[PDB]
Design a protein around this motif. Structure first.
Motif, PDB file in Angstrom:
ATOM      1  N   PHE A   1     -88.714  14.126  19.034  1.00  0.00           N
ATOM      2  CA  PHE A   1     -87.481  14.046  19.922  1.00  0.00           C
ATOM      3  C   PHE A   1     -86.656  15.236  19.679  1.00  0.00           C
ATOM      4  CE2 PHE A   1     -88.268   9.218  19.595  1.00  0.00           C
ATOM      5  CZ  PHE A   1     -87.954   8.958  21.000  1.00  0.00           C
ATOM      6  N   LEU A   2     -86.294  15.827  18.568  1.00  0.00           N
ATOM      7  CA  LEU A   2     -85.222  16.911  18.476  1.00  0.00           C
ATOM      8  C   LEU A   2     -85.807  18.111  19.330  1.00  0.00           C
ATOM      9  CD1 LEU A   2     -82.537  17.386  17.111  1.00  0.00           C
ATOM     10  CD2 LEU A   2     -83.458  18.532  15.296  1.00  0.00           C
TER      11      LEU A   2
ATOM     12  N   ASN B   1     -84.288  20.191  22.057  1.00  0.00           N
ATOM     13  CA  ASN B   1     -83.825  21.551  22.023  1.00  0.00           C
ATOM     14  C   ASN B   1     -84.580  22.466  22.969  1.00  0.00           C
ATOM     15  OD1 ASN B   1     -81.505  21.278  20.297  1.00  0.00           O
ATOM     16  ND2 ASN B   1     -82.824  21.332  18.376  1.00  0.00           N
ATOM     17  N   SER B   2     -85.898  22.489  23.008  1.00  0.00           N
ATOM     18  CA  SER B   2     -86.847  23.116  23.717  1.00  0.00           C
ATOM     19  C   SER B   2     -86.044  23.092  25.366  1.00  0.00           C
ATOM     20  CB  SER B   2     -88.244  22.525  23.784  1.00  0.00           C
ATOM     21  OG  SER B   2     -89.203  23.444  24.312  1.00  0.00           O
ATOM     22  N   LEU B   3     -86.185  21.933  25.801  1.00  0.00           N
ATOM     23  CA  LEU B   3     -85.912  21.452  27.341  1.00  0.00           C
ATOM     24  C   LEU B   3     -84.400  22.192  27.348  1.00  0.00           C
ATOM     25  CD1 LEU B   3     -87.925  18.289  27.708  1.00  0.00           C
ATOM     26  CD2 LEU B   3     -88.082  20.387  28.668  1.00  0.00           C
ATOM     27  N   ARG B   4     -83.476  22.187  26.523  1.00  0.00           N
ATOM     28  CA  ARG B   4     -82.198  22.707  26.747  1.00  0.00           C
ATOM     29  C   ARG B   4     -82.380  24.044  26.569  1.00  0.00           C
ATOM     30  NH1 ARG B   4     -77.575  19.081  25.222  1.00  0.00           N
ATOM     31  NH2 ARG B   4     -76.493  20.796  23.915  1.00  0.00           N
TER      32      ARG B   4
ATOM     33  N   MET C   1     -78.869  20.705  19.576  1.00  0.00           N
ATOM     34  CA  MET C   1     -78.596  19.617  18.926  1.00  0.00           C
ATOM     35  C   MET C   1     -79.136  19.330  17.587  1.00  0.00           C
ATOM     36  SD  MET C   1     -80.155  17.272  21.995  1.00  0.00           S
ATOM     37  CE  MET C   1     -79.015  16.311  23.263  1.00  0.00           C
ATOM     38  N   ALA C   2     -78.686  18.275  16.903  1.00  0.00           N
ATOM     39  CA  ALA C   2     -79.180  18.078  15.493  1.00  0.00           C
ATOM     40  C   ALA C   2     -79.547  16.515  15.401  1.00  0.00           C
ATOM     41  CB  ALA C   2     -78.273  18.265  14.495  1.00  0.00           C
ATOM     42  N   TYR C   3     -80.495  16.302  14.606  1.00  0.00           N
ATOM     43  CA  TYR C   3     -80.999  14.730  14.679  1.00  0.00           C
ATOM     44  C   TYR C   3     -79.961  14.208  13.613  1.00  0.00           C
ATOM     45  CZ  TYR C   3     -83.699  10.687  15.161  1.00  0.00           C
ATOM     46  OH  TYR C   3     -84.314   9.800  15.570  1.00  0.00           O
TER      47      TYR C   3
ATOM     48  N   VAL D   1     -79.175  17.603  28.698  1.00  0.00           N
ATOM     49  CA  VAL D   1     -78.782  18.636  28.539  1.00  0.00           C
ATOM     50  C   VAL D   1     -77.241  18.812  28.683  1.00  0.00           C
ATOM     51  CG1 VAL D   1     -80.669  19.762  29.606  1.00  0.00           C
ATOM     52  CG2 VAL D   1     -79.076  19.213  31.201  1.00  0.00           C
ATOM     53  N   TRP D   2     -76.671  18.023  28.370  1.00  0.00           N
ATOM     54  CA  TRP D   2     -75.217  17.774  28.256  1.00  0.00           C
ATOM     55  C   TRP D   2     -74.585  18.934  27.125  1.00  0.00           C
ATOM     56  CZ3 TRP D   2     -72.259  15.501  31.888  1.00  0.00           C
ATOM     57  CH2 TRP D   2     -70.799  15.566  31.850  1.00  0.00           C
TER      58      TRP D   2
END
Ligand SMILES: [Cu+2]
Length: 193
Positions: free
Chosen positions: A17-18, A22-25, A50-52, A136-137
């Motif tokens: 998930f994380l 991050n990749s996509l962001r 982002m962090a989990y 992507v916010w």
């Protein structure tokens, strides 16, 4: 992605998930993400990493445990955004579920299209691109997800720390990768502070 309970969610899925997020962001921030409205989405000047978050995971879990494909009510996820997803493959691997959900949510950009104006107008919102925009916010920096196997579906819920999708706000600030933050790699385009 670290120090979460053994609550039926795996550390592999959490990592997935994380990492997808991050990749996509990153891909968006770098100007590399295909916009179905034409061209690529604009570069982000300070797309945050982002962090989990295990606490966010636990509120996502309360939604996922119910096994009804439904958006939780705001107070059930105080101050957090939310994305939901379902697959008919009930016994699906949870890391695989994490990947499929993330792609489906993010897929709204290439398919429905967003465009160069990132103001979250009512018009943009009701276009059905709201899973993407939360992914992507820029200001959203906490992610917590849960994958629940149900009778006739694999049910996935992600919750987002600082809620995104605030009407009138920019999804993210436009500009060259890292131009508006310190701890950021121009080949990656994610800010860590
Ligand atoms: Cu939704």
């Amino acid at each position: 992605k670290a120090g979460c309970p053994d609550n039926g969610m795996s550390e592999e899925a959490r990592q997935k998930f994380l990492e997808m997020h991050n990749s996509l962001r990153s891909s968006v921030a770098l100007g590399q993400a295909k916009d179905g409205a034409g061209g690529n989405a604009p570069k982000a000047a300070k797309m945050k990493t982002m962090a989990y978050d295990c606490e966010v995971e636990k509120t996502a879990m309360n939604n996922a445990k119910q096994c009804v494909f439904k958006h939780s009510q705001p107070n059930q996820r105080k101050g957090l955004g939310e994305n939901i997803f379902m697959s008919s493959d009930s016994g699906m691997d949870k890391a695989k579920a994490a990947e499929q959900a993330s792609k489906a949510w993010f897929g709204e950009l290439a398919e429905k299209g967003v465009g160069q104006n990132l103001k979250l107008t009512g018009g943009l919102f009701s276009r059905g691109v709201g899973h993407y925009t939360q992914m992507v916010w820029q200001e959203t920096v906490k992610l917590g997800c849960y994958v629940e196997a149900c009778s006739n579906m694999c049910y996935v819920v992600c919750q987002y720390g600082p809620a995104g999708n605030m009407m009138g706000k920019d999804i993210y600030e436009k500009g060259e990768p890292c131009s508006k933050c310190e701890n950021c790699d121009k080949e990656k385009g994610l800010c860590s502070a």
